[PDB]
Design a protein around this nucleic acid. Sequence first.
RNA 1: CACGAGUUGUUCGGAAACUGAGCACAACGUUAUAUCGUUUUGUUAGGAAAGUGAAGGAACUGAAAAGGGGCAACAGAGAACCUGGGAUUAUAUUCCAAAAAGAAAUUGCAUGUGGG
RNA 2: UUACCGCGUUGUUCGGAGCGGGGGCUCAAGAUUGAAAAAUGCAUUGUGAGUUCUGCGCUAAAGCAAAAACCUGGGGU
RNA 3: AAUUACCGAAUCUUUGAACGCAAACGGCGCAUGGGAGAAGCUCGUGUCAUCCCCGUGCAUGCCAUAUUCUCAGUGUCGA
RNA 4: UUCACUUAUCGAAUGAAGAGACCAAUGGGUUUAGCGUAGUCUGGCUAUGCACCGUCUAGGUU
Lengths: 212, 254, 118
Amino acid sequence: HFAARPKNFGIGQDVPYARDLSRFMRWPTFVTMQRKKRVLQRRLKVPPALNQFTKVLDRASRNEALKLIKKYAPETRKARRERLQKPLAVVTGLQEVTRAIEKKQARMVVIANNVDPVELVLWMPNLCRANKIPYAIVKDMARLGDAIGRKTATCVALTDVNAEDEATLKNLIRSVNARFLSRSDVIRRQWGGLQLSLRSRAELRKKHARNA
Amino acid sequence: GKTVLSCRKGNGSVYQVHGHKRLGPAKLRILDYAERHGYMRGVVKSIEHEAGRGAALARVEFRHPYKFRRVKELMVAPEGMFTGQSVFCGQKAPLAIGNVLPLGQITEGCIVCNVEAKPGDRGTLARASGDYCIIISHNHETGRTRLKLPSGQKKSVPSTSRAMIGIISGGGRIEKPVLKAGNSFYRFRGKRNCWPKVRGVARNPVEHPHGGGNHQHIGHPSTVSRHSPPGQKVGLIAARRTGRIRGGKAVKGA
Amino acid sequence: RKSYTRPQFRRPHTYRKPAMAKPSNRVTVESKDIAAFNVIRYPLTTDKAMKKIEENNTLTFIVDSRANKTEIKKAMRKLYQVKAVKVNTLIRPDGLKKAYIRLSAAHDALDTANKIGL
RNA sequence: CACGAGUUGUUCGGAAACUGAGCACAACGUUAUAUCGUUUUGUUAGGAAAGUGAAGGAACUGAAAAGGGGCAACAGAGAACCUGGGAUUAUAUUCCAAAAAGAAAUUGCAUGUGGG
RNA sequence: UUACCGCGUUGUUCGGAGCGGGGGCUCAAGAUUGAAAAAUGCAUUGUGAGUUCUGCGCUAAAGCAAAAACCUGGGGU
RNA sequence: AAUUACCGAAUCUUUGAACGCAAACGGCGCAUGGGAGAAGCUCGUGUCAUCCCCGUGCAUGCCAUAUUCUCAGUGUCGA
RNA sequence: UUCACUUAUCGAAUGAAGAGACCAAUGGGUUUAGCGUAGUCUGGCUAUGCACCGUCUAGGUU
Ligand SMILES: [K+]
Ligand SMILES: [Mg+2]
Ligand SMILES: [Mg+2]
Ligand SMILES: [Mg+2]
Ligand SMILES: [Mg+2]
Ligand SMILES: [Mg+2]
Ligand SMILES: [Mg+2]
Ligand SMILES: [Mg+2]
Ligand code: NA
Ligand code: NA
Ligand code: NA
Ligand code: NA
Ligand code: NA
């Protein structure tokens, strides 16, 4: 005595099932504001100095660079205390990295692309280009911090490497220069932003079709 | 001098409405998905009289679109509505007295009431006792409809705003003479504290611009400017004309 | 966190650690064998009180003004080994509280009054 | 004027425990200044204001429930008790004692009987 | 089964959408019989008039406050 | 010493910034620890439901913190 | 100054309760730029213009 009893979910008809209301719900204020900020930064016209932080290094090269930095990560408190009872590393920290760039000690610089007051690193590519230091802009300060052993990191500089990794460093410098140091005129020229929404774009396309 | 009464009334201390016996705001249904894409059917449960208002009010029961529940609304009844009647609201509705449909679907030259000025306002025009609008024309290019308001002025509204077919009930109310001060007493006891009315010339100079003198008179013209400060703006305000009109009566308004 | 079926967001349910019990912030020594002497103060010796003693098996006492009938019964039993079947109380116009205590028929109010020293 | 005494309630009036014309704590806003404003036409607040049923494997744990807390009527709503007394100097639908002068109604928790 | 006539109030009305006659179900207010209760109180049992709660069901351009608390059902459990 | 003077140890009712919620109310709670209870239960005891009494914590805001407490976001990533 | 745009700003409704597309550009990409053709630029490759590709997929009824 088993049979189907289908339900009608048209206007009128049967009381419907619980629908998902995520897109039309009233969210908390901080959720709303943090989404609208991204929308605004897409819609407005972005000057080149700020826009240069959107074009980042490719995923494969970023993985290789972070592997090298992790290999040369600095010491921990336990390691330093176990030492000094009787090494080569990367340079971390804004002040030390800036000093290494202002001298010629740095051989490459990696800069995170999502620092919160952007004025902390807005000027860094221009300085690395005024000197002849190869540099790249990568995806996450959280990933840089994971590489060096901290929570986050704004920038990292490599000064000296071992002969086991000299060839890797040379290839990395070449691939990084392909994207950042050699395209400096386009970088200085290119504006950004000015994206319509999908809704607006579809409306424009439909209007052109109807008027043609 | 002292403050004038028309300015005292703006604090609204003892001059606010008497609303203890009222039943609530009268409004159409909420413009939601079912009304935008189909129709909903309701049944008229009762017809009642609310203190201070000249028209009847109808209680209409619908089914909740999303839950297992019943929803009761309170609208202004058109003339002819009866208890047990079925009322349809939405796009696919037929044409009958009491049905709510979009103005773009109502034909040209028809009589409507409870009109929405902006889509979703839930009804703001032609709501007093015997009033109605007339649909003059449609314009499919811009999606607007032109109406003739009860005052005689013409207004254009979007074709998506809704209206109800018919005329508001209770017409002919102001045709009966009142004959007594007690009748006026009881009429205004249900509205607000505004009766009886003393005359400015019968007040004193400290109270009104018209008061004072050995004879009861205004010493200056009673037509005042539109830019007058509060307290000076009593009389005929920014009048374009005065006296008894001979000939056709024009429309009044901006 | 996945699908919401209501048109507005409401704070989620989280883990709440219950409040610990602190060390007590009172240091005074209080005795459990003493409170009845505070509850019951002294008896009354007026003509109405004597008439009640002789006729209705009732004793009349001035009691603590903040005590209630249940406490007065318990104190009566503890102080004098008797059982009270009714307590009626009033607050006097001079501010003191007076109780009319009727003993069970198994006890003689005259004998208890003699023991008290009335 | 002096001295000594007198007001007794499971049910009477109030509170516990309703809402009204209304008030204004929180939250937010404003002001050199909060000692200002909004705060019931369903109804705070750019607004994350719900703290426990059933559970299962003795307490813990957490599903479902938009719209914060409170006050304002001793004539509105609500509200389980009546007579007799030879029972006072003064209180009584409040006191009376095993033949309660007596007869009831109602609330909480337990125990037996029957039914289930 | 009623032929525009019939029923009914002091009074402004009711009837094929069911008048009237026979027999019934139910509600509201009273009466009666008894337990209480004579064991109490003090030193009978009939008419007429007046007054409350009650019933007769529910002026007006004036049209009869709300909530708690409680009651019954429809469903599932 | 019911003498005086001084002070190091104590006691310190109801309120009030008054702060669990109220207030012409000696009113009403939630959590936790105790006390009394010839109801019942049991072998004069012991135990005790409903009712009753006492101690402690429980305002809003802000700061710090959690051997590293529980979460939320079509914010940025990465599995 | 007149036309178009939408993200600032303004108004309304709601318990923020169902917007738009899938019907395909004058659209987006090295984390959905993969690949050709023609110029221009410094050896890792870019820029401009045009072509193909991916993103890109459903269905009442007739
Ligand atoms: K205030
Ligand atoms: Mg005068
Ligand atoms: Mg009393
Ligand atoms: Mg005197
Ligand atoms: Mg009353
Ligand atoms: Mg009472
Ligand atoms: Mg007297
Ligand atoms: Mg207090
Ligand atoms: Na004047
Ligand atoms: Na005159
Ligand atoms: Na005159
Ligand atoms: Na109110
Ligand atoms: Na109250």
